[PDB]
Ligand binder design. Structure first.
Ligand SMILES: [Cl-]
Lengths: 11, 173
């Protein structure tokens, strides 16, 4: 249950 | 530093280098996130939930004839300062493991069979690839190797990490 995801970081 | 004197054993960015990775737990821990020239990354960010121990391992990698292999990891993460309101146990590192095996289809490697190479952290060295991603680069080596091949593993214990690429090679004589 990823708090942030790096793609920049987003919820 | 060129392919003329290094033999690649694993390149996560290549066609057959993406298939074979196993996440433990299968879901809720390390999860694939494509990022794009699409790149298959593995990420985990359970900074709110307690007692995390998430594992990710490769498939069997032959060492060919190498007595020593080199592991180059490109990644990025979030400092716990960057994330207000996280658990007091927020981590900013992760652990790199390996397990030598003559068998190419191990289906029950435990935490205690894996040997820790080092703790990986976002440090001073990095790389830069419409936009540009700035990613920490770390390289580690292990040896002497003796078995036909080996497995690599990565452990998360409560950090917010994105494994963008993993490269494994050795140096010609
Ligand atoms: Cl990866």
């Amino acid at each position: 249950x990823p708090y942030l995801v790096y793609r920049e970081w987003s919820p | 530093g060129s392919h003329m004197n290094e033999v690649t054993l694993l390149d996560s960015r290549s066609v057959q280098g993406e298939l074979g990775w196993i996440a433990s737990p299968l879901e809720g821990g390390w999860e694939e996130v494509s990022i794009m020239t699409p790149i298959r990354t593995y990420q985990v960010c359970n900074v709110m939930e307690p007692s995390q121990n998430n594992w990710l391992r490769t498939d069997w990698i032959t060492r060919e004839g190498a007595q020593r292999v080199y592991i180059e990891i490109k990644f990025t993460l979030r400092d716990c300062n960057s994330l207000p309101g996280v658990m007091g146990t927020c981590k900013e590192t992760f652990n790199l493991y390996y397990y030598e095996s003559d068998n190419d289809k191990e289906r029950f490697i435990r935490e205690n069979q894996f040997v820790k190479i080092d703790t990986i952290a976002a440090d001073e060295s990095f790389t830069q690839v419409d936009r540009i991603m700035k990613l920490n680069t770390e390289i580690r080596d292990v040896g002497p190797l003796s078995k036909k091949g080996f497995y690599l593993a990565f452990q998360d214990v409560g950090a917010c990490i994105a494994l963008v690429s993993v490269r494994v090679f050795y140096k010609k004589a």
